[PDB]
Amino acid sequence: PTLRETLGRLAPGTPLRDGLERILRGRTGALIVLGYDDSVEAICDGGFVLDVRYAPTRLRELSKMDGAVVLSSDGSRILRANVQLVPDPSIPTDESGTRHRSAERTAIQTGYPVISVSHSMSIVTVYVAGERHVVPDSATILSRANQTIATLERYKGRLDEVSRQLSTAEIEDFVTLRDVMTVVQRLEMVRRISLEIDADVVELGTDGRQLKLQLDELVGDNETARELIVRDYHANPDPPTAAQVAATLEELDSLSDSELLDFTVLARVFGYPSTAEAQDSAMSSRGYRAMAAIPRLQFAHVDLLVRSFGSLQNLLAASADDLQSVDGIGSMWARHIREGLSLLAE
Amino acid sequence: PTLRETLGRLAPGTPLRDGLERILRGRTGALIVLGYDDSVEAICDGGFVLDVRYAPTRLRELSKMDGAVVLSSDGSRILRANVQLVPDPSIPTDESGTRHRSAERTAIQTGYPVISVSHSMSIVTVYVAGERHVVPDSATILSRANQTIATLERYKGRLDEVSRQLSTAEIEDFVTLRDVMTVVQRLEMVRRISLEIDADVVELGTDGRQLKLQLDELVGDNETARELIVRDYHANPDPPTAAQVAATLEELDSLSDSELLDFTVLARVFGYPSTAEAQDSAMSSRGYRAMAAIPRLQFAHVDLLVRSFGSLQNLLAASADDLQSVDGIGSMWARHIREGLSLLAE
Amino acid sequence: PTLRETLGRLAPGTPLRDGLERILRGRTGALIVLGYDDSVEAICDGGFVLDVRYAPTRLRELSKMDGAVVLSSDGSRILRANVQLVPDPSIPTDESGTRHRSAERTAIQTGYPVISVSHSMSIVTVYVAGERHVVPDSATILSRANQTIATLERYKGRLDEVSRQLSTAEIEDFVTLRDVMTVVQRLEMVRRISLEIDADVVELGTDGRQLKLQLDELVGDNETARELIVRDYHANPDPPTAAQVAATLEELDSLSDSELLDFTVLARVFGYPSTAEAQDSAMSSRGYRAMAAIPRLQFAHVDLLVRSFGSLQNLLAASADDLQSVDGIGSMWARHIREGLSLLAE
């Protein structure tokens, strides 16, 4: 299990987190470990074998029995107890405390989710992936998520107003480099914050069953916005394809924020003259952005219309029946597009 | 016994909670069976019979007899002490531990609450209707309520701005389906948060006598606004009657988040064409919410005048004696309505 | 399952008592039952299974589950855990307390040991053979034993005095029923007190590893004296047989103190006239007791000599050559015997 899959299983509501909570309220230690390989058995010793179905009380009792509990890799069947997790002393560990030192060295030797709850406190700890993560109470998670929501909604506001300004300008298109990639910079920023809040909701799980509602209501279409902007705006002789769009997407994601705030890097990712004299360079819209607003319209139609036209200003100068002249287009169907596109001018 | 009625009967301030706090300060356990009938008297054995009047001190003293206390159904009399509580072993339960297993099995046998305070520990368990629920300290409930009240106030603010936009559009009638439903969606979400916070408020009972204040100050007139908007916005020859409006209210309450984030399903709940063109359709308000701002105005009179008119546009275009011409309206009541209409016309 | 085997296996030194002491020092409860059958599995529900060999710390750890621990009949196989040992509620038990009530009824159904230990105290309870018995600290048992040893010592002194008187009568020709029989009564009484203190010797097991040697010193050859006296003082036409001697032995042992202290009853139970004049009567002795003091002497030879003679007066009047004339007896052993009689004459 990945870090943000172990955290998902440790999210509230899940049976494993229920057992952790029952232990925590029981004010007693617990060293629960997940998985069953030859190394887990080769390190564990001093315990029984059970083979009974998982329940919120079995781990609680066997942890009360003052020992480490081992669980199936899916955390469904219990087959050990009382074990003394004894890895070698060669593995470094800066923790002070035998239970937690054993937990850390166990996690390092065997990349499995080992849970180290300490008595006298309400602390839940996991040492996976080379770091230890103290599972936090819901209050701090909700606080930081609420703080992040304000910045992210301010970000949606900035995106919407900048993009509306750019679209209105592109109706009478005259393009500058700063104007063509400020939208991209802000879009990448909002994408990054969306991913961060996604990590928070993943670690939160079900107690905060409202941040998913907030994100669904707020961010709406962001990945589709990135796809549309890259498809429409990509200075390269051949038409960009799905593979090229994806490659540009992870190329953007590879950029750092310091690299994100520089227009030269964002230009060379798309592929532009990197010189400072190209800031006023302009190009015609390919057609994805403005025409994508048409409802009940498929992407294949968008691609074939782009192939038939190759730009958006010629679409603006296009007649009412030349759309019908495109292959696979009828008369009344084409009339819908021209009426919508004409209304898009204002 | 509903779970969210016994939770209330256990809330701070009640005599039962006073007895529970005294028991918890006694650093001893308790096995309290609130209730007594044929099922319990067949289940319980080997104890004393008191039939005294309940008092927190009496309960605290009897809980020291290392048995099970059996209060009366309404929690007013202590009637059996030191009873053994043999359950029916056939019932399958997961709570491993004789006290907890017997508590759960008696709970299954008869759905009375069975509070099981752990020995020398500060946990209070609830065993109503096959559900287990640790009674949390009021600090945690207040923390989560404080976290949720921010979401409630943000939802109220967005509802307020959306409703202001709706009123401004109504006074110069031009309304789309989105303009209508962006009000009802926020309304239903606010009601959802209202019920969720009211659950925590009733759990707190008396300790949190600030949360009820804030909730009533923030939510305000939600039910009335909902009822008026349901009577107003409905695609039918005549606005639905009180019974029909109520039934539509349970219809909305039956809807969940998945069919609440979609506008088309909400439109069809009222009964609307599901086409995206119908999403762009236009409908004139019947006037209920718009002219309901008139103070001290009779609801029956409002319904009568709307029936005589049918839309807010007619009311805005009504003459000085047009309302007086309507039956049941004199001269003073005529221009009294128009005074608000003239002022709101700006 | 018998008390004076199960207490012995519960005596200090035995592994079960070591485990019980480990539990007691831990200030936690316990519930251990030794024996599995169809009725035990019928009672058992909600437990575990290990099948591991006995060792002191298993019960210590497993006692924390607030259930019960079940071990095989031999009490050396660990086979369940955590089980809520629920017997028939119809079984009477005046014990108040769910742990102990379950222990008592489980023991009454399955007559195996059911050891119950109350937490926060140092009490050990055994429920063998349908009767409770608190295992006491070794101090109380030692004190009772010390008090009883003084009584045993003074009884031994009285027996020594009266038996020396009887021996002095034996070297003469004065034999009376009362003098012959009072030593027998005293000897039976001291034998019964020896058994009573041997019970506590077994209960101590190893803690009282001096009372057994004190009893070995003080008691001496009580059973040998029983056999010799019964075979000698046999007022019947023929000397008794070994089976008849043994049968008379348990016949006397069946007498309680009330009819043992009565001289006439003791005379009658072996078989004598009940007249008070028989107490002054003189009966011929086989000489077993009189000449049993000869060292390196075989019982079979003495029995054959008694068969050849029939009375002690024959030995007192035995010549030098008549003893040699007896079949199976040589001449060198002949004047071994008559030397002893001659020496005791003075």
- Interatomic CA distance for residues B204 and B11, integer angstroms: 6
Radius of gyration of chain C (CA): 28
Q: Which residue has the tokens 């107490």?
A: C279
| Minimal CA separation from B67 to chain C, in Å | 7
| Minimal CA separation from A71 to chain C, in Å | 16
C77 touches C40 (CB < 8 A): no
SS (HEC) of chain A: CCHHHHHHHCCCCCHHHHHHHHHHHCCCCEEEEECCCHHHHHHCCCCCCCCEECCCCHHHHHHHCCCEEEECCCCCEECCCCECCCCCCCCCCCCCCHHHHHHHHHHHHCCCCEEEEECCCCEEEECHHHCCEEECCHHHHHHHHHHHHHHHHHHHHHHHHHHHHHHHHHHCCCCCHHHHHHHHHHHHHHHHHHHHHHHHHHHHCCCCCCHHHHHHHHCCCCHHHHHHHHHHCCCCCCCCCHHHHHHHHHHHHHCCHHHHCCHHHHHHHHCCCCCHHHCCCCCCCCCHHHHCCCCCCCHHHHHHHHHHHCCCHHHHCCCCCHHHHCCCCCHHHHHHHHHHHHHHCC
User: Is B102 known to sit in a ligand binding site?
Assistant: yes
Count CB atoms within 10 A of the CB of residue A101.
18
Test mutation, C52, C63, C64, C119, chain A, max A CBs within 10 A:
C64
3-state secondary structure of B324: helix
* Residue B143, C-beta contacts closer than 8 angstroms, at least 6 positions apart: A139
Maximum Cα interatomic distance, chain C, rounded to a whole number of Å: 85
Count CB atoms within 10 A of the CB of residue A136.
14
**Residue A237 is which amino acid?**
P
- Interatomic CA distance for residues A212 and A221, integer angstroms: 14
Task: Determine whether the interchain pair C101/B85 forms a contact, defined as Cβ–Cβ distance below 8 Å.
Answer: no
* Burial class (CB within 10 angstroms; exposed 0-12, middle 13-18, buried 19+) of C98: buried
- Nearest CA-CA partner of A321 in A309, A340, A337, A310: A337
Using the Cα atoms of residue B120, residue B122, residue B124 and residue B125 in order, give the sign of their dihedral.
negative
Q: What is the resolution of this structure in A?
A: 3.1
Nearest residue on chain B to A21, alpha-carbon basis: B134
- Nearest CA-CA partner of C43 in C3, C94, C91, C78: C91
Q: Residue C116 is inside which H or E element, if any? A: strand C114-117
Angle made by CA atoms B290, B292, B294, in degrees to the nearest 5: 110
Task: Determine whether the interchain pair A58/B96 forms a contact, defined as Cβ–Cβ distance below 8 Å.
Answer: yes
- Interatomic CA distance for residues B292 and B340, integer angstroms: 10
Q: What is the dihedral of CA A185, A188, A192, A198, to 10 degrees?
A: 140
3-state secondary structure of B209: coil
Task: Determine whether the interchain pair C46/B96 forms a contact, defined as Cβ–Cβ distance below 8 Å.
Answer: yes
Task: Determine whether the interchain pair A50/C48 forms a contact, defined as Cβ–Cβ distance below 8 Å.
Answer: yes
Q: Counting one residue from B and one from C, how many pairs have CB atoms under 8 Å apart?
A: 36
3-state secondary structure of B80: strand
Nearest residue on chain C to B97, alpha-carbon basis: C66
User: Is B287 known to sit in a ligand binding site?
Assistant: no
Test mutation, A65, A77, A82, A84, chain C, max C CBs within 10 A:
A65
**Residue A245 is which amino acid?**
V
Beta bridge mates, B70: B33, B80
Task: Determine whether the interchain pair B46/C96 forms a contact, defined as Cβ–Cβ distance below 8 Å.
Answer: yes
Using the Cα atoms of residue A329, residue A334, residue A338 and residue A343 in order, give the sign of their dihedral.
negative
Fill in the DSSP letter of residue B222.
Answer: S
| Minimal CA separation from C83 to chain A, in Å | 12
Encoded tokens for A9: 């299983």
- Nearest CA-CA partner of B72 in B103, B104, B30, B113: B113
Encoded tokens for C52: 């591991």
Sheet holding C77-78, edge to edge: C52-53, C77-78, C69-71, C30-34, C114-117, C124-126, C133-135
Rounded to 10°, the helix B211-219/B177-204 angle is 170
User: Is B192 known to sit in a ligand binding site?
Assistant: no
A34 touches A71 (CB < 8 A): yes
Task: Determine whether the interchain pair B123/A57 forms a contact, defined as Cβ–Cβ distance below 8 Å.
Answer: no
Domain boundaries in chain B? 1-135, 136-288, 289-346
- Interatomic CA distance for residues A108 and A75, integer angstroms: 20
- Nearest CA-CA partner of B119 in B98, B88, B92, B94: B98
Q: Residue C334 is inside which H or E element, if any? A: helix C334-345
3-state secondary structure of B258: coil
Cβ-based contacts of A27 with chain B (< 8 Å): 121
* Burial class (CB within 10 angstroms; exposed 0-12, middle 13-18, buried 19+) of C54: middle
Nearest residue on chain A to B137, alpha-carbon basis: A25
3-state secondary structure of B83: strand
Chain breaks in chain A (C to N over 2.5 A) after: none
**Strand pairing category for B48-53 and A133-135:** unpaired
Task: Determine whether the interchain pair B96/A57 forms a contact, defined as Cβ–Cβ distance below 8 Å.
Answer: yes
**Strand pairing category for B30-34 and A30-34:** unpaired
What are the backbone angles phi and psi of residue C131, rounded to the nearest 5°? -145, 130
Of B96, B150, B261, the CB nearest to A61: B96
Beta bridge mates, B320: none
Q: Which residue has the tokens 């038409």?
A: A239
What are the backbone angles phi and psi of residue B118, rounded to the nearest 5°? -65, 150
- Nearest CA-CA partner of A201 in A218, A185, A188: A218
Count CB atoms within 10 A of the CB of residue A292.
17
Q: Residue B307 is inside which H or E element, if any? A: helix B299-309
User: Is B98 known to sit in a ligand binding site?
Assistant: yes
Technique used to solve these coordinates: cryo-EM
Radius of gyration of chain B (CA): 28
User: Is B336 known to sit in a ligand binding site?
Assistant: no
Nearest residue on chain C to B84, alpha-carbon basis: C98
Task: Determine whether the interchain pair B261/A25 forms a contact, defined as Cβ–Cβ distance below 8 Å.
Answer: no
- Interatomic CA distance for residues C282 and C298, integer angstroms: 28
3-state secondary structure of B345: coil
| Minimal CA separation from B94 to chain A, in Å | 7
Task: Determine whether the interchain pair C66/B93 forms a contact, defined as Cβ–Cβ distance below 8 Å.
Answer: no
**DSSP structure string for C10-46:** TSTTSHHHHHHHHHHHTT--EEEEE---HHHHHH--S
- Interatomic CA distance for residues A306 and A312, integer angstroms: 8
Encoded tokens for A328: 């696979």
- Interatomic CA distance for residues B136 and B160, integer angstroms: 34
Residue ranges of E strands in chain B: 30-34, 48-53, 68-71, 77-83, 114-117, 127-128, 131-132
- Interatomic CA distance for residues B330 and A329, integer angstroms: 64
**Helix ranges restricted to H, C88-235:** 98-109, 138-171, 177-204, 211-219, 222-232
User: Is B335 known to sit in a ligand binding site?
Assistant: no
Cβ-based contacts of A25 with chain B (< 8 Å): 123, 134
Nearest residue on chain C to A81, alpha-carbon basis: C50
Cβ-based contacts of B96 with chain A (< 8 Å): 55, 57-58, 60-61
Cβ-based contacts of C52 with chain A (< 8 Å): 48
Rounded to 10°, the helix B263-270/B177-204 angle is 90
User: Is C234 known to sit in a ligand binding site?
Assistant: no
Encoded tokens for A158: 């900035």
- Nearest CA-CA partner of B43 in B100, B98, B107: B107
Nearest residue on chain B to C65, alpha-carbon basis: B97
- Interatomic CA distance for residues A225 and A289, integer angstroms: 9
Cα→Cα distances B213→B86, B139, B208, B222, B304, Å: 46, 18, 9, 15, 36
- Interatomic CA distance for residues A106 and A111, integer angstroms: 8
- Interatomic CA distance for residues A30 and C20, integer angstroms: 25
Chains touching chain C at 3 or more Cβ pairs under 8 angstroms?
A: A, B
- Interatomic CA distance for residues A22 and A115, integer angstroms: 14
- Interatomic CA distance for residues A199 and C16, integer angstroms: 55
| Minimal CA separation from C65 to chain A, in Å | 6
Encoded tokens for C82: 């955590």
